[PDB]
Structures are given as C-alpha cells and as structure tokens.
Swiss-Prot record:
Residues 3-58 are annotated as: Disordered. The chain holds residues 29 to 160 of 409 of the full protein. This is Nucleoprotein. Residues 5-130 form the CoV N NTD domain. Belongs to the gammacoronavirus nucleocapsid protein family. Residues 44-58 have a biased composition (Basic residues). It is found in: Virion; Host endoplasmic reticulum-Golgi intermediate compartment; Host Golgi apparatus. It comes from Avian infectious bronchitis virus (strain Beaudette) (IBV). Residues 3-134 are annotated as: RNA-binding. ADP-ribosylated. The ADP-ribosylation is retained in the virion during infection.
C-alpha cells in the first residue's frame, strides 16, 4: 500500500540509535518559518518508526520525527498539549495554541520539503538531520 495523504512541510529529524526517547529542544522546537503569523507558531513532532532491507528480511532503522502545525497532519484532530505516545508539542513565545492556520500539509508531487533550521536552538544530540541548502 502507498500512503495517499499529504506530507510534512519540513524534512525529518532522525535518531542516531534505536529506541531513542522523544526529542527535547533548546528553544521553542518550532522550525524557522518567517511566513507564518506569530500567533500560529505552534505544532507537534510525530514519531515514525522506520525499517529497511538487510540480513534475512527487514531491519529496524532509527526513528524519524516530522513536524506539523496544530490541526494538520495525521494528528490534526488532536488539540495542543494532548498526551499520546510519539507526539510532542511545541510553541514559540507569542503563540496562541488555540489558533488554526491555513498552512495545511504538503502535496509531495508539487512542492519539495523545506530545510530545517532552529535559530533559537534545535533538538538534542540524540538527533540529526540532512543538510539542504537555504
């Protein structure tokens, strides 16, 4: 089966080892994105367990986490702060986490993913992401 849905606007962050806890962030944990209302600077990171072929059959690879603005993505029906394994919530100063933006999600056939930057910090050392130029 091929997932039919829309995707995250940003690249993934990726754990370096198996069974890593959720990412902790210096600063808001909200990706750099100047094209949003300050009131709308809030969302969640969502865990994605990965695999790939290796010896015998399939082989576990470290988790990826993907960021979605509140009210969008797989956990669109969740409200900011709602507890669920594999969901961590982030908000920048001045955010109103009741607000809902028009950003929606990314259609992969049309737009490439945005590069991740965190001018106010970034995730802890259990995590890394690929370089994509600005």
């Amino acid at each position: 089966h091929m997932s039919s849905g829309n995707a995250s606007w940003f690249q993934a962050i990726k754990a370096k080892k198996l069974n890593t806890p959720p990412p902790k962030f210096e600063g808001s944990g909200v990706p750099d994105n100047e094209n949003m209302k300050p009131s709308q600077q809030h969302g969640y990171w969502r865990r994605q367990a990965r695999f790939k072929p290796g010896k015998g059959g399939r082989c576990p690879v470290p988790d990826a986490w993907y960021f979605y603005y509140t009210g969008t993505g797989p956990a669109a029906d969740m409200n900011w702060g709602d507890t669920q394994d594999g969901i961590v919530w982030m908000a920048a100063k001045g955010a109103d986490t009741k607000s809902r933006s028009n950003q929606g999600t990314r259609d992969p056939d049309k737009f490439d993913q945005y590069p991740l930057r965190f001018s106010d910090g970034g995730p802890d050392g259990n995590f890394r992401w690929d370089f994509i130029p600005l």
